Amino acid sequence: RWQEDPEPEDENLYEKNPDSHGYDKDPAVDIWNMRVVFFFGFSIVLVLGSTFVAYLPDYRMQEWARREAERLVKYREAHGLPIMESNCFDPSKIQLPE
Amino acid sequence: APPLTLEGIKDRVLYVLKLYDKIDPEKLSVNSHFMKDLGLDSLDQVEIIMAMEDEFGFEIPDIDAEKLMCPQEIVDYIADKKDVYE
Amino acid sequence: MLKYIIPTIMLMPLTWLSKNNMIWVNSTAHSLLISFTSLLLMNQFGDNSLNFSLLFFSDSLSTPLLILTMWLLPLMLMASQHHLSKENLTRKKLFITMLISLQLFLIMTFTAMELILFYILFEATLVPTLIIITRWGNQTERLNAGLYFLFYTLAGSLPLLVALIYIQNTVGSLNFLMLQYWVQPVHNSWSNVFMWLACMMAFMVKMPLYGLHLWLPKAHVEAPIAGSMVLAAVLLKLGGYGMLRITLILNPMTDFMAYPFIMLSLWGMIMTSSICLRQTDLKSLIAYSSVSHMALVIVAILIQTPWSYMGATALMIAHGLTSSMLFCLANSNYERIHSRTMILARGLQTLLPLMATWWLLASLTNLALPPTINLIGELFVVMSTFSWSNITIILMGVNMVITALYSLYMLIMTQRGKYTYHINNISPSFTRENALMSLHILPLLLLTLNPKIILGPLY
Amino acid sequence: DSWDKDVYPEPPRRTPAPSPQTSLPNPITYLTKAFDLLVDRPVTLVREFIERQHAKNKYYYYHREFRRVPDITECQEKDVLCMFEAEMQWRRDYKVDQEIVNIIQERLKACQQREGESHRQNCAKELEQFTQVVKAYQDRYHDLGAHYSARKCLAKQKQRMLAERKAAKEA
Amino acid sequence: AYLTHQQKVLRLYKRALRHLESWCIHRDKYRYFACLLRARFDEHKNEKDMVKATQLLREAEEEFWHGQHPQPYIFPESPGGTSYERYECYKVPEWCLDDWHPSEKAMYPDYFAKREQWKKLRRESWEREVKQLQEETPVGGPRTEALPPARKQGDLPPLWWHIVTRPRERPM
Amino acid sequence: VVRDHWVHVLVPMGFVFGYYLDRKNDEKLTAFRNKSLLYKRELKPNEEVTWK
Amino acid sequence: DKRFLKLLRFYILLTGIPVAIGITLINVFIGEAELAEIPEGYVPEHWEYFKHPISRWIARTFF
Ligand SMILES: CCCCCCCCCCCCO[C@@H]1O[C@H](CO)[C@@H](O[C@H]2O[C@H](CO)[C@@H](O)[C@H](O)[C@H]2O)[C@H](O)[C@H]1O
Ligand SMILES: CCCCCCCCCCCCO[C@@H]1O[C@H](CO)[C@@H](O[C@H]2O[C@H](CO)[C@@H](O)[C@H](O)[C@H]2O)[C@H](O)[C@H]1O
Ligand SMILES: CCCCCCCCCCCCO[C@@H]1O[C@H](CO)[C@@H](O[C@H]2O[C@H](CO)[C@@H](O)[C@H](O)[C@H]2O)[C@H](O)[C@H]1O
């Protein structure tokens, strides 16, 4: 064996502080800890961050691509050209082997 | 469902026993032992418990049932199960 | 990235110079402010990634992982400050320093433009992670868990170091932008078979790949709650993120080298899902749940399709928040009853009605209830593996069934039934515990309204 | 109006004039009049108020114009500076082509709903146009993989051009 | 089996009547067949030979298994019944009230005043209850789960709290 | 400046300092400012650089 | 439980309501940009390619 301290009992934060938020034993620190978590966590990051994300300018140009495609289809159909050609690159700029 | 009372439970426990042809309704009392006083056997006591279950709509397990030996014991058992305190 | 690296370092002076009773308030508040500013990384373009300097860049793959990493630091602080209350003050500040330094290595790891800078930071995360597990774990086995975590990783990483340096010699660069243009195909040969293995085994161990996963249930069961949160949410995703980048230079050899690892993942996911049905330890159940989910990510990365890469990116983010939530939920029970035995404390919905709501929401995301991003990620992967081979829907279907069985079994066993009579210290849920749970589920459910920002570069 | 009728065409509307063959009052007629009175009018005035404020603050935004640069065919091997621009241009065109297929798909689906039980015969042009564009999109971009690039696209085309040449030689 | 021979016969009699009732349904028809079934038990009531009596029990049980109703009637709140454990979700242990916020306790000043007397009564009695169980238990621990009554005035029957304060069968 | 609230400038200053350093890096990477084929143009009458 | 949900609502609404009102006033009195052709010889600023004023503000201020 040895000289050892016994296992301490369980402290229920509610006994000393029935209004405890579970952050700190000091009631004033416990209130402030709750306030920063809620204000900075919910009011700022989650509410403003959600608003910021909703109004992101054309994330990855998906809207421009849709506007551009409209421009091309309008042009090509009017001029009788295919909407889309099978060849991505102009075949005159390619030199096949053999 | 209407609540039960100790007086109400006793009335119906006796009521059922007064409709059993093997008991004498005048000689019956809450404290009558089914064998020592009323002279029934154990096969009869199983039937009495069976009839009490049918009367109140719940089952008394055989381990508990074999000990209920007078009408007052049945009244006490039912009251305890149904949380009847008056 | 210096607008994030520097304020992350400044969290260390802040913690050490804070009043003795304000270390948690100050570190939590200012780490939330850093999380707020990380949203500026979502200035992404359709064609070009966001390249800041010769050292750091941020595309659509690393941006959501960075935001997940910086969001997790405040959550880890909230989750730890209860069980560290009796800790010595200096040893509380050293604990927080280990978490801050982990965030620092992590945000630099996800934005390193050069792969050998990625390797060093990727490896650097081991030290703070190992110290957290072995110093602040509770059981005897935390020491063995540290060794398994350390040596499983290093067994794979050291071959990766040789392969990357060999790649720099032959190609002349390891800059990821340069690799996109200078990549040459890999032709069959035993020499390239082992170059492929060296490049992928380090990441397979981190995911982990089924068979190589034994370190993970050990580490989770022994780590403190904050360690388990970062382990599941982010550190597993270092394997996925690394694989999504390195596979660029492994083509077309990935066509046939993938087969043994797809087989392990497709079958492994059913095996680890079924293990969850018979786990007796709640944390171990959640650990094995991660293996099953990360099996899908491995398959998706290896079949190399636009839909599979989108699905893998969403799965990594969705799993990060859900698995972190589940560990936090199980921890709140543990802080009361001080055991991880799942069957010990039952019928808790009677005693903690609101915490039972969190248990429900966490389970629903874990089984991928639509339209959660858990379902978006898992569905996109299943669509792409079906085109890879139709028969995979059989294995995908079964896993979905077994995943629901163990998710609701965990809910039913702990929350429903009758409460355990002799357990009488189930105190009402603290505000800290409820706010911790909501800071997991609310952002996870909010991302359903706008899922494109977690779908990765191929969106 | 709001969009371009050429890009999103709608065949001219044909509405049969009411031919009531019953003495009874039609419930839909009066509910329609109530809807215009109780919903449309108040909603219309509220909008006109908002349209007045916008007219007092008129400002503009533009659709970006992307100059054309040399494509990957004109880039020297391992010349990153020219490859980068050709690669970025190819990526922009890939997104645009994706939205072209979406437009043609949108026409196809609008036609299927508009024509009702006659859609099978009255949406033959839309189906044909959709079939052709999906063939062109498949030829350009299908099977390139997650790590697609202008180089992989070009290599796929050259392989296709080679096959077409050889069959033509057989003729 | 710890059940005596008498207990087995009486248990079989009850179980046989209940399954007979499920078959018959109608009360008049059940009464007719319950009496014939009773007559069979009365037939061997006096069998003094244990070997034969046990043999009669074996065949009787074999016959019951063949004739048992596949879907017998069960009282709704009995194990296996349609209302078994229906109300467990409403039974809350009384120790949950120690955690109530003071503002919650202020709403029931009279209930929590009484509750304190019971908790006071529980502390005062505990030591004597442990002592009584120490003095009445033979060396080597108890041999049965039976518990003693109180032997004096002012004593409470040992281990009474969780029987007396258990949740009502219809709590909410 | 207070004896309770000077530690709350460290992280905000670190962000501002990091922001400043990030922009100074862009001053080292102007080799192609107004020289790419895609965006090369003529300067406006008052403009000195297309971006800074 | 009730206390947490009341605190959760208060801190969501503490910024949620001003943001929702601020958005309404922006949509109504400022409104959106109109699509136009780029005038000859005019080089728009990078934030003039977006419609919503809040999107324009985000691109101008941060990006
Ligand atoms: C843009 C960056 C914004 C950063 C925002 C950071 C928010 C941090 C919020 C913490 C605010 C707490 O501010 C607090 O104020 C009081 C008065 O000065 C200090 O002093 C107080 O100490 C104790 C609290 O334990 C009180 O009971 C006592 O009345 C008072 O002396 C606290 O030590 C300080 O912690
Ligand atoms: C988890 C572990 C996963 C293990 C996966 C195992 C994959 C096995 C891949 C086997 C194919 C290796 O690739 C193969 O190697 C030999 C190298 O000698 C090459 O062939 C070369 O060597 C052979 C000798 O055997 C010569 O006959 C041949 O003329 C020469 O070119 C082949 O051109 C190549 O197709
Ligand atoms: C309440 C939620 C807050 C979320 C955070 C967003 C905060 C910023 C909100 C308002 C942003 C300012 O909104 C701004 O309105 C003016 C309208 O004059 C627009 O400006 C436009 O009109 C003005 C005339 O007034 C002209 O200079 C010019 O035609 C054009 O710039 C801006 O493009 C837009 O950015």
mmCIF file with all atom_site columns, C-alpha atoms and ligand atoms in Angstrom, chain A residues 48 51-52 55, chain D residues 56-60, chain G residues 15-24 26 29-31 33 47-48 50-58 60-62, ligand 3:
data_model
loop_
_atom_site.group_PDB
_atom_site.id
_atom_site.type_symbol
_atom_site.label_atom_id
_atom_site.label_alt_id
_atom_site.label_comp_id
_atom_site.label_asym_id
_atom_site.label_entity_id
_atom_site.label_seq_id
_atom_site.pdbx_PDB_ins_code
_atom_site.Cartn_x
_atom_site.Cartn_y
_atom_site.Cartn_z
_atom_site.occupancy
_atom_site.B_iso_or_equiv
_atom_site.pdbx_formal_charge
_atom_site.auth_seq_id
_atom_site.auth_comp_id
_atom_site.auth_asym_id
_atom_site.auth_atom_id
_atom_site.pdbx_PDB_model_num
ATOM   1  C CA  . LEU A 1 48 ? -24.483 37.141 -38.500 1.00 0.00 ? 48 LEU A CA  1
ATOM   2  C CA  . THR A 1 51 ? -26.663 36.172 -42.813 1.00 0.00 ? 51 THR A CA  1
ATOM   3  C CA  . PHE A 1 52 ? -23.190 36.686 -44.261 1.00 0.00 ? 52 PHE A CA  1
ATOM   4  C CA  . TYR A 1 55 ? -25.592 37.032 -49.127 1.00 0.00 ? 55 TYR A CA  1
ATOM   5  C CA  . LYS D 2 56 ? -35.420 56.942 -56.513 1.00 0.00 ? 56 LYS D CA  1
ATOM   6  C CA  . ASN D 2 57 ? -32.202 54.903 -56.117 1.00 0.00 ? 57 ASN D CA  1
ATOM   7  C CA  . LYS D 2 58 ? -31.400 53.445 -59.534 1.00 0.00 ? 58 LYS D CA  1
ATOM   8  C CA  . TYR D 2 59 ? -28.008 51.745 -59.799 1.00 0.00 ? 59 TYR D CA  1
ATOM   9  C CA  . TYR D 2 60 ? -26.560 49.107 -62.067 1.00 0.00 ? 60 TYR D CA  1
ATOM   10 C CA  . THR G 3 15 ? -29.269 40.156 -33.265 1.00 0.00 ? 15 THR G CA  1
ATOM   11 C CA  . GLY G 3 16 ? -31.844 38.286 -35.335 1.00 0.00 ? 16 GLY G CA  1
ATOM   12 C CA  . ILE G 3 17 ? -34.521 40.973 -35.079 1.00 0.00 ? 17 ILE G CA  1
ATOM   13 C CA  . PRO G 3 18 ? -32.246 43.954 -35.890 1.00 0.00 ? 18 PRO G CA  1
ATOM   14 C CA  . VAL G 3 19 ? -30.799 41.955 -38.783 1.00 0.00 ? 19 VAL G CA  1
ATOM   15 C CA  . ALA G 3 20 ? -34.251 41.016 -40.079 1.00 0.00 ? 20 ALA G CA  1
ATOM   16 C CA  . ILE G 3 21 ? -35.415 44.627 -39.797 1.00 0.00 ? 21 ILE G CA  1
ATOM   17 C CA  . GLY G 3 22 ? -32.193 45.940 -41.305 1.00 0.00 ? 22 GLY G CA  1
ATOM   18 C CA  . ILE G 3 23 ? -32.586 43.573 -44.243 1.00 0.00 ? 23 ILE G CA  1
ATOM   19 C CA  . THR G 3 24 ? -36.181 44.678 -44.827 1.00 0.00 ? 24 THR G CA  1
ATOM   20 C CA  . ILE G 3 26 ? -32.364 47.580 -47.261 1.00 0.00 ? 26 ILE G CA  1
ATOM   21 C CA  . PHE G 3 29 ? -35.438 51.639 -49.705 1.00 0.00 ? 29 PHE G CA  1
ATOM   22 C CA  . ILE G 3 30 ? -32.143 50.725 -51.373 1.00 0.00 ? 30 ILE G CA  1
ATOM   23 C CA  . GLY G 3 31 ? -33.331 47.817 -53.479 1.00 0.00 ? 31 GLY G CA  1
ATOM   24 C CA  . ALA G 3 33 ? -29.184 46.811 -58.910 1.00 0.00 ? 33 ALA G CA  1
ATOM   25 C CA  . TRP G 3 47 ? -18.101 44.618 -56.744 1.00 0.00 ? 47 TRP G CA  1
ATOM   26 C CA  . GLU G 3 48 ? -20.325 46.140 -59.445 1.00 0.00 ? 48 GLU G CA  1
ATOM   27 C CA  . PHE G 3 50 ? -23.276 41.694 -58.187 1.00 0.00 ? 50 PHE G CA  1
ATOM   28 C CA  . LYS G 3 51 ? -26.939 42.593 -57.769 1.00 0.00 ? 51 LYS G CA  1
ATOM   29 C CA  . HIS G 3 52 ? -27.926 42.614 -54.111 1.00 0.00 ? 52 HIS G CA  1
ATOM   30 C CA  . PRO G 3 53 ? -26.577 45.596 -52.133 1.00 0.00 ? 53 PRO G CA  1
ATOM   31 C CA  . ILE G 3 54 ? -25.476 43.350 -49.265 1.00 0.00 ? 54 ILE G CA  1
ATOM   32 C CA  . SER G 3 55 ? -23.579 41.164 -51.726 1.00 0.00 ? 55 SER G CA  1
ATOM   33 C CA  . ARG G 3 56 ? -22.061 44.335 -53.177 1.00 0.00 ? 56 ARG G CA  1
ATOM   34 C CA  . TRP G 3 57 ? -21.099 45.464 -49.669 1.00 0.00 ? 57 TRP G CA  1
ATOM   35 C CA  . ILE G 3 58 ? -19.490 42.114 -48.833 1.00 0.00 ? 58 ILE G CA  1
ATOM   36 C CA  . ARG G 3 60 ? -16.336 45.674 -51.629 1.00 0.00 ? 60 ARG G CA  1
ATOM   37 C CA  . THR G 3 61 ? -15.486 45.486 -47.933 1.00 0.00 ? 61 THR G CA  1
ATOM   38 C CA  . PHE G 3 62 ? -13.762 42.117 -47.523 1.00 0.00 ? 62 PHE G CA  1
HETATM 39 C C1  . LIG H 4 .  ? -29.177 44.236 -41.243 1.00 0.00 ? 3  LIG H C1  1
HETATM 40 C C2  . LIG H 4 .  ? -28.325 43.114 -41.896 1.00 0.00 ? 3  LIG H C2  1
HETATM 41 C C3  . LIG H 4 .  ? -26.927 43.674 -42.200 1.00 0.00 ? 3  LIG H C3  1
HETATM 42 C C4  . LIG H 4 .  ? -26.069 42.596 -42.912 1.00 0.00 ? 3  LIG H C4  1
HETATM 43 C C5  . LIG H 4 .  ? -24.660 43.204 -43.171 1.00 0.00 ? 3  LIG H C5  1
HETATM 44 C C6  . LIG H 4 .  ? -24.712 44.084 -44.413 1.00 0.00 ? 3  LIG H C6  1
HETATM 45 C C7  . LIG H 4 .  ? -24.388 45.540 -44.003 1.00 0.00 ? 3  LIG H C7  1
HETATM 46 C C8  . LIG H 4 .  ? -24.402 46.450 -45.264 1.00 0.00 ? 3  LIG H C8  1
HETATM 47 C C9  . LIG H 4 .  ? -25.864 46.701 -45.692 1.00 0.00 ? 3  LIG H C9  1
HETATM 48 C C10 . LIG H 4 .  ? -25.984 47.922 -46.696 1.00 0.00 ? 3  LIG H C10 1
HETATM 49 C C11 . LIG H 4 .  ? -24.837 47.975 -47.701 1.00 0.00 ? 3  LIG H C11 1
HETATM 50 C C12 . LIG H 4 .  ? -24.843 49.373 -48.418 1.00 0.00 ? 3  LIG H C12 1
HETATM 51 O O1  . LIG H 4 .  ? -25.811 49.363 -49.503 1.00 0.00 ? 3  LIG H O1  1
HETATM 52 C C13 . LIG H 4 .  ? -25.431 50.156 -50.568 1.00 0.00 ? 3  LIG H C13 1
HETATM 53 O O2  . LIG H 4 .  ? -26.596 50.913 -51.094 1.00 0.00 ? 3  LIG H O2  1
HETATM 54 C C14 . LIG H 4 .  ? -26.157 51.821 -52.178 1.00 0.00 ? 3  LIG H C14 1
HETATM 55 C C15 . LIG H 4 .  ? -27.360 52.500 -52.755 1.00 0.00 ? 3  LIG H C15 1
HETATM 56 O O3  . LIG H 4 .  ? -27.125 53.865 -52.828 1.00 0.00 ? 3  LIG H O3  1
HETATM 57 C C16 . LIG H 4 .  ? -25.412 51.099 -53.292 1.00 0.00 ? 3  LIG H C16 1
HETATM 58 O O4  . LIG H 4 .  ? -24.713 52.136 -54.074 1.00 0.00 ? 3  LIG H O4  1
HETATM 59 C C17 . LIG H 4 .  ? -25.256 52.350 -55.322 1.00 0.00 ? 3  LIG H C17 1
HETATM 60 O O5  . LIG H 4 .  ? -26.191 53.520 -55.264 1.00 0.00 ? 3  LIG H O5  1
HETATM 61 C C18 . LIG H 4 .  ? -25.425 54.739 -54.908 1.00 0.00 ? 3  LIG H C18 1
HETATM 62 C C19 . LIG H 4 .  ? -26.363 55.860 -54.716 1.00 0.00 ? 3  LIG H C19 1
HETATM 63 O O6  . LIG H 4 .  ? -26.866 55.798 -53.407 1.00 0.00 ? 3  LIG H O6  1
HETATM 64 C C20 . LIG H 4 .  ? -24.399 55.088 -55.986 1.00 0.00 ? 3  LIG H C20 1
HETATM 65 O O7  . LIG H 4 .  ? -23.166 55.432 -55.352 1.00 0.00 ? 3  LIG H O7  1
HETATM 66 C C21 . LIG H 4 .  ? -24.148 53.953 -56.934 1.00 0.00 ? 3  LIG H C21 1
HETATM 67 O O8  . LIG H 4 .  ? -25.193 53.958 -57.922 1.00 0.00 ? 3  LIG H O8  1
HETATM 68 C C22 . LIG H 4 .  ? -24.105 52.597 -56.280 1.00 0.00 ? 3  LIG H C22 1
HETATM 69 O O9  . LIG H 4 .  ? -22.883 52.465 -55.553 1.00 0.00 ? 3  LIG H O9  1
HETATM 70 C C23 . LIG H 4 .  ? -24.386 50.125 -52.807 1.00 0.00 ? 3  LIG H C23 1
HETATM 71 O O10 . LIG H 4 .  ? -24.041 49.233 -53.903 1.00 0.00 ? 3  LIG H O10 1
HETATM 72 C C24 . LIG H 4 .  ? -24.853 49.291 -51.660 1.00 0.00 ? 3  LIG H C24 1
HETATM 73 O O11 . LIG H 4 .  ? -23.738 48.544 -51.127 1.00 0.00 ? 3  LIG H O11 1
#
